[PDB]
Amino acid sequence: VSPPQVDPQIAPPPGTAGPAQPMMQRSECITTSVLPGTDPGAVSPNQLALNLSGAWQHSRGAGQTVAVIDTGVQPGPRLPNVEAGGDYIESTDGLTDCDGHGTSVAGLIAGQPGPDGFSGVAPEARLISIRQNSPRFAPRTPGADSEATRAASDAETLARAVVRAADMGARVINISLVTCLPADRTIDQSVLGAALRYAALEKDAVIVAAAGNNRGAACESNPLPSGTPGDPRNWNGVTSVSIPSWWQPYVLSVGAVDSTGQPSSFTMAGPWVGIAAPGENIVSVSNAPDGGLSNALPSERDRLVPLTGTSYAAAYVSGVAALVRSKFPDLTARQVVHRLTTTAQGAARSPSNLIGAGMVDPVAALTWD
Ligand SMILES: [Cl-]
């Protein structure tokens, strides 16, 4: 197991939308809800950890377009700033979210302030929603439904969606969904690699991906740095590949921290992790018809649980990237990634396989010389 490398003979795919085969909805749609006993309208400690108040004195993300490659984004009063980017599941415009996830992610990135303590990181940014996946759907033809087959199908649409996002003018491309494969069964991803390279270099997009959560295949943390000469981050020891995070250097892979900046218990360790952001007790926008604030989803036997995960951490980082690109519009994607990582809270330590350079620091990123 070694860091992946593009095959220069393999072209990026087209950005055509649509599923590879017809899909059918297998599970009822879900909306995010308010967890009883909470006050979602209070300013989240996650915002305070990031000092978004301080950041907004430098930038609110004006002029930036962020693509949300996710489960769709439901427009509403807190998300009036969402553009259709299409659908790889059905034939919608990307503005239907049957899962809640894309909406929560979009809200963190560029949700609007309102009559409460909630705001997106970059509320003056514009969003493009591309629905690239949904676990509520499966192929209409009930064929092989294996981890391998699902993962390959997911990579195939992800690569197209990345090209589509870049070609639609996205400056930041957010990939909060994660697919993992065991290392002994990771197949050629040359097309996905080609797509990510196209978007990151030729189209100069900052691509941000969630690192994954422990427990395709179930994601599992990889062994930590082990002092191997020439392999300080322990690529050699990887057993569980997080996609597209492992596609360094094109993708900034984001781990989750608690509100104090410590690695979240569930954050997936890997040698690709570059940075972190808050991933616990998330409050964002709902895909329910009112489009208000939510902070929970149903778990077993329909009991509500908080929103947690690296998906939300990635979203925060995408929002911060939009702030940085608005303030410094001439920086390349590589320069923007360098700025984010070199100013993160743990940048002066060797990178962590849990949190990379540590929790993103928006004000530091916006003021560093
Ligand atoms: Cl704040």
Which residue is it, tokens 């017809």? 22
CATH H-level, domain 1-369: superfamily: Peptidase S8/S53 domain (3.40.50.200)
φ, ψ of residue 209 in degrees (nearest 5): -130, 140
Residue of 70, 87, 97, 361 marked active site: 70
Residue 187, SS3 per DSSP: coil
Which residues surround the ion ligand 1 when the cut-off is CB under 5 Å?
47-48, 51-53
The Å distance, Cα 243 to ligand 1 centre, comes to 32
CA-CA distance, 280 to 257, in Å (whole number)? 7
The Å distance, Cα 85 to ligand 1 centre, comes to 31
CA-CA distance, 121 to 110, in Å (whole number)? 6
H/E stretch holding 102 reads helix 101-110
Method: X-ray
CA distances, 191 to each of 13, 40, 187, 280 (Å) = 7, 41, 11, 33
Let me know if 101 is a catalytic residue: yes
H/E stretch holding 82 reads strand 82-87
The Å distance, Cα 52 to ligand 1 centre, comes to 4
Q: What is the largest CA-CA distance in the chain?
A: 56
Give the DSSP letter of residue 200: I
CA distances, 210 to each of 112, 164, 202, 234 (Å) = 23, 20, 23, 19
CA-CA distance, 355 to 214, in Å (whole number)? 14
CA-CA distance, 34 to 297, in Å (whole number)? 8
Return the half-sphere exposure (C-beta side, CA atoms, 13 A cut-off) of residue 30: 22
Which residue is it, tokens 């030729």? 202
Measure the N-to-C terminal CA separation of the chain; round to a whole number of Å.
Answer: 37
CA-CA distance, 200 to 196, in Å (whole number)? 6
What's the one-letter identity of residue 256?
A: A
Resolution value in angstroms: 1.5
CA-CA distance, 1 to 79, in Å (whole number)? 42
CA-CA distance, 294 to 198, in Å (whole number)? 36
Answer whether 127's CB lies under 8 Å from 75's CB: no
CA-CA distance, 231 to 225, in Å (whole number)? 8
- With CA atoms as reference, report the closest residue to 158 among 184, 182, 189, 200: 189
| Cα 280 → chain centroid | 15
CA distances, 78 to each of 51, 66, 107, 186 (Å) = 21, 16, 7, 40
Residues 6+ apart with CB under 8 A from 18: 86, 87, 88, 91
Residue 137, SS3 per DSSP: strand
Rounded to the nearest 10°, the torsion over CA 349, 335, 270, 128 is 140
The helices-and-strands tally (H runs, E runs) of the chain is 8, 15
Answer whether 46's CB lies under 8 Å from 232's CB: no
The Å distance, Cα 50 to ligand 1 centre, comes to 6
The Å distance, Cα 48 to ligand 1 centre, comes to 4
The Å distance, Cα 44 to ligand 1 centre, comes to 9
CA-CA distance, 366 to 57, in Å (whole number)? 10
* 244 upstream amide cis, omega within 30 of 0: yes
φ, ψ of residue 104 in degrees (nearest 5): -65, -40
Residue of 44, 134, 284, 311 marked active site: 311
Q: How would you classify the pairing of strands 206-210 and 240-243?
A: unpaired
- With CA atoms as reference, report the closest residue to 74 among 291, 282, 283, 293: 291
Answer whether 313's CB lies under 8 Å from 279's CB: yes
- With CA atoms as reference, report the closest residue to 340 among 233, 211, 243, 206: 206
Answer whether 267's CB lies under 8 Å from 311's CB: no
Residue 155, SS3 per DSSP: helix
Q: How would you classify the pairing of strands 304-306 and 296-298?
A: antiparallel
The Å distance, Cα 325 to ligand 1 centre, comes to 20
- With CA atoms as reference, report the closest residue to 124 among 176, 59, 186, 189: 59
Helix ranges restricted to H, 198-332:
310-327
Let me know if 70 is a catalytic residue: yes
Residue of 101, 134, 284, 294 marked active site: 101
Tokens, residue 366? 């916006």
CA-CA distance, 207 to 254, in Å (whole number)? 11
The Å distance, Cα 272 to ligand 1 centre, comes to 29
The Å distance, Cα 57 to ligand 1 centre, comes to 11
DSSP code per residue over 307-342: B-SHHHHHHHHHHHHHHHHHHSTT--HHHHHHHHHH
What is the b/e burial string over 177-212, where b = at least 16 CB atoms within 10 angstroms of the residue's CB? bbbbbbeeebeebbbbbbbbbbbbeebbbbbbbbbb
The Å distance, Cα 309 to ligand 1 centre, comes to 21
- The alpha carbon dihedral of 157, 256, 296, 126 has a sign of negative
